[PDB]
Symmetry: C3
Subunit: 152 residues, 3 copies
């Protein structure tokens, strides 16, 4: 590697990081990365459990994002967490989530999603009237069928 | 911290970054990170509003991703935005989104998702026939009930 | 830029990275970034296809995340992939996915999502009974209408 940074194991765990980056310039990205990989991530992050115990790292993550107001006097913020785009257009999955090398959840380049297991919304779902037999029925579709039976 | 990089506030905002990384090697990741956190992110990103005004940073994000074709002559790209996996298998949430420390949207390790509020698909939803009373009805399920009433 | 790191094109592709970061300290983030952008990402990642051929980079991504157990003897892991929060509260989209500059999929600050095209769940969807005509019908809602017809 052109540059390698290593933080060795300390005597006792502490809050220090191998690399810390701060910018006070509002007009540019604090950090940028560009690469040209054939078959890998431009940025690869790996979290490894420090412990043999399979629950030890329940509160850890590979990537943690926080979105905050101005420290002194701030009235709030409207900043976004993660923004993904393709200014050229891609035919690849925009977001692809796996576990044990199996596709679990993804977002297609058209915005349609796939979830591998039973899911929950604590609210309503607005969508189009069903075409196929395995499409979700709308209240309209149901009420239209009921109207025809009520007529006879 | 082992290494600290600081960009101070400039007289006028400009496009400069504290750290910029570029690779022209197609065979490896431009950047890699590995850590062993018990209870934190391997990479932590924090966006802070530069202004007291709660709408000032509406177009900002913590993480921005772009996916582009080869600059000169490129016919397109099939690269993915974000790819998440667990080669060991994890029992943690694969994607976990909160606001004000409250779970808003997540993807479970099995691929099932949870959304806290009313959602919208500008299309159809393909899914399984309902088992529970609070499961979404399919067109099949509705049409099966209607068939029995039409019979009598 | 305050710091620029460049890996030039090698004679033959290889696994080397421009920047590689490793920490063995369980008590702190291997890397942290903080910025104050008005209208950009704190971290910006760009993947560019190395080739003119629009399928050449089908297995590449801008961001790749892996979640692993302790290398020797580990029993498993419970770590999360991506964790997003706003300790201040934001009114911005928490996750916003586009292709060709058009909104394809997003998560609102309340946890409600939007998908632009037909989607699939390989399971059931638990949700609330419909209010509007374009809301998905539950099994309860359907069965309630059928009960009234069965009565007459």
């Amino acid at each position: 590697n052109a540059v390698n940074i290593v933080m060795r194991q300390p005597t006792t765990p502490n809050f220090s990081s191998a690399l810390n980056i701060t910018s006070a310039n509002e007009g540019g990205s604090a950090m940028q990365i560009r690469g040209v990989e054939k078959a890998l991530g431009t940025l690869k992050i790996t979290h490894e459990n420090p412990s043999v115990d399979k629950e030890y790292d329940k509160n850890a993550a590979a990537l943690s994002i926080d979105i905050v107001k101005k420290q002194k006097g701030g009235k709030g913020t409207a900043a976004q967490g993660i923004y993904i785009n393709s200014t050229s257009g891609t035919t690849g999955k925009l977001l692809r989530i796996r576990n044990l090398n199996d596709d679990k959840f993804y977002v297609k380049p058209d915005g349609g999603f796939y979830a591998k297991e039973t899911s929950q919304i604590d609210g309503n779902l607005k969508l189009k009237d069903p075409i196929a037999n395995d499409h979700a029925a709308t209240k309209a579709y149901v009420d239209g069928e009921v109207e025809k039976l009520k007529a006879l």
